[PDB]
Amino acid sequence: ALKKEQHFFKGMQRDLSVSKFNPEYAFDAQNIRITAREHDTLLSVSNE
Amino acid sequence: IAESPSGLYFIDNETNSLYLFNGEIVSLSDKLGFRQWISTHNVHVNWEPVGYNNYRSFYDKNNNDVYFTYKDHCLCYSELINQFTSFMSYEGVPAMFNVSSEFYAFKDGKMWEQFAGDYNMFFGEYKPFSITFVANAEEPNDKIFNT
Amino acid sequence: QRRGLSNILFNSGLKVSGKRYISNTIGCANKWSIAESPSGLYFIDNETNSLYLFNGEIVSLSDKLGFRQWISTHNVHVNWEP
Amino acid sequence: NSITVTKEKSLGEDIDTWTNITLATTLDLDGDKGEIVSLNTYNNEIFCF
Amino acid sequence: RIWRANIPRAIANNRDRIRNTWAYIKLGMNTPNTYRTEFHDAIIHYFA
Amino acid sequence: KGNKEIPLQSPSGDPVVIDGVLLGQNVLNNYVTLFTKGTNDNIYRLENKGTYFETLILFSGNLNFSTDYPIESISVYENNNIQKVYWVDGLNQARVIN
């Protein structure tokens, strides 16, 4: 196509206008863990 | 109110904020953008085990996770990164506590050892996981979202 | 302590004054993981799954340098014995 | 708005000081903020909500 | 999904465009209504 | 977002009309105490129920009150029965009300 955009997940953020949201955060997440637990999955979304 | 090495996490219903006292009061909800979520979920009624009405804050000593449980959701805050992680499927659980070097929870008259069963199986039931993220790149421009 | 770390105020007139807690929730449970050094006190807390360093303020070296998983997967309740 | 304080536990061959409440060392907070919702300790200091 | 409004022209002539080094731009609702109107941002196109 | 009127119903349920100009308020814990002037010099106690204010008229007389001297108050909660509201004008003596 024409353009792209990369999204990382440093945390979960809310309360911010959709026009001005930050791609580094997730708007809403259910049963995930972003810290490395039982495996080296830090800064990578992983299960509960 | 949940004690931790980092401070005292308490939720004030009067001011609609999730504070953290560590010598100075810091509003975590304002800092991390959760004013609306707490402002829309506050109630005057005090917490009691039969019906969750206000929040019930626990603390996972083994992993530095703070769970602000509610009657229909469980907002998890991680002190390792100082960020809210997810909306956990641990709602309506009366107790969540550490015994020695393991984290435990008590629901429906039984003790459930946490972080020990099969993935995506909470209290014997399968709960889904998801992640939502706004896609607004060059937001003045109108875009066709494709892949 | 097993879930505490205090500073025993002594000779700060040689009388043993009261104590002073540095952390009410963090404390070493295995005595033999404690190593003294000029930089501080390196101890491993099995309760919290971290490798701390006390130099006036408790700093989690495992979290700082990314070793949470390695210690969380290698902890045990049993005390050290030769 | 009132906090009673017991004696320091002797940890010697006598009674448990905590069970013996005499109300001889009370402390009253301001009544125009509200009732004492919670008492907590953090790093060698008591904090009252 | 983007609004675009032609900037008014001077009341004195009704022909001259708003030509100046700067200008005050004021959007508003003055008709009775009960809506929540999120207003994210506004781009102004000029000719320099 | 706009405002929503809250009816001032008495404990019997009848409407309670407030006399006139308000000089000051005071929220103790959940009781709002109004010091209003008008034809008389009134004091009210408003408790927010689910959808209405349970209004009581604690006094209706001639406590000399002026609009040029509004009210400033401090209110303490000692117990269920001793709930006081100390208030002062710039003109009259300091007063108390349970």
Which one of B4, B13, B21 makes the best mutation probe of the D interface by having the most chain D beta carbons within 10 Å?
B21
CB B3 within 8 A of CB C24: yes
Q: Nearest CA to CA, how far is B24 from chain C (Å)?
A: 17
- Judge whether F27 is closer than 8 Å to chain D, CB to CB: no
Containing H/E element for B130?
strand B130-132
- 3-state helix vs strand vs coil in chain E, percent to 5: 0, 5, 95
Q: Which residue of F has its CA nearest to D35?
A: F77
Contact state of C48 with B62 under an 8 Å Cβ cutoff: yes
- D 1-49 → B contacts, CB under 8 A: 38, 40-42, 47, 49
Write out the E strands in chain F: 22-24, 31-36, 41-48, 53-61, 72-77, 83-88
- F 45-74 → D contacts, CB under 8 A: 74
**Please, which chains are in contact with F (at least 3 CB pairs closer than 8 A)?**
D
Cβ neighbours, 10 Å, residue F67: 10
**Please, which chains are in contact with A (at least 3 CB pairs closer than 8 A)?**
B, C, E
Widest Cα–Cα separation across chain A: 40
Contact state of B140 with E43 under an 8 Å Cβ cutoff: yes
Residue that has been written with the tokens 């006399």 in this structure: F19
Q: Which residue of B has its CA nearest to E2?
A: B142
Q: Which residue of C has its CA nearest to A36?
A: C69
Chain B positions touching A41 (Cβ under 8 A) are none
Number of H helices and E strands in chain F, helices first, is 0, 6
Containing H/E element for B31?
helix B28-31
Cβ neighbours, 10 Å, residue F47: 14
The C-alpha atoms of residue F32 and residue F75 are separated, in whole angstroms, by 10
Encode B62-125 in three state secondary structure: CCCEEEEECCCCEEEEECCCCEEEEEECCCCCCEEEEECCEEEEEECCEEEECCCCCCCEECCE
Resolution (A): 3.3
- Judge whether E1 is closer than 8 Å to chain B, CB to CB: yes
Q: Nearest CA to CA, how far is C25 from chain B (Å)?
A: 6
The C-alpha atoms of residue B100 and residue B106 are separated, in whole angstroms, by 16
CB B85 within 8 A of CB A35: yes
At B18 the three-state DSSP class reads strand
Q: Do chains C and B touch (3 or more CB pairs under 8 A)?
A: yes
**Please, which chains are in contact with D (at least 3 CB pairs closer than 8 A)?**
B, C, F
Write out the E strands in A1-48: 28-30, 32-33, 46-47
CB A32 within 8 A of CB A41: no
Phi/psi of residue F2, each to 5°?
A: -80, 180
Contacts of F4 (CB under 8 A, 6+ apart): none
Which one of D1, D32, D36 makes the best mutation probe of the F interface by having the most chain F beta carbons within 10 Å?
D32
Containing H/E element for C64?
helix C61-64
CB C51 within 8 A of CB C42: yes
Q: Which residue of A has its CA nearest to B62?
A: A37
Which one of C19, C24, C26, C57 makes the best mutation probe of the D interface by having the most chain D beta carbons within 10 Å?
C24
Contact state of B10 with D49 under an 8 Å Cβ cutoff: yes
Of A29, A15, A34, give the one whose Cα is nearest residue B29.
Answer: A15
The C-alpha atoms of residue A13 and residue B36 are separated, in whole angstroms, by 11
The C-alpha atoms of residue B133 and residue A24 are separated, in whole angstroms, by 9
Q: Do chains A and C touch (3 or more CB pairs under 8 A)?
A: yes
At E42 the three-state DSSP class reads coil
Contacts of B120 (CB under 8 A, 6+ apart): A31, A47, A48, B126, B127, B128, B129
Chain D positions touching C56 (Cβ under 8 A) are none
Contact state of D1 with F29 under an 8 Å Cβ cutoff: no
Chain C positions touching B64 (Cβ under 8 A) are 48
- Judge whether B24 is closer than 8 Å to chain E, CB to CB: no
Cβ neighbours, 10 Å, residue F88: 15
Contact state of D47 with B8 under an 8 Å Cβ cutoff: yes
> What kind of experiment solved this structure?
cryo-EM
Nearest by CB to residue B61, choosing from C48, C58, C68, is C48
Please give the angle made by the CA atoms of B29, B4 and C80, to the nearest 5 degrees.
145
**Please, which chains are in contact with E (at least 3 CB pairs closer than 8 A)?**
A, B
- C 19-78 → D contacts, CB under 8 A: 20-24
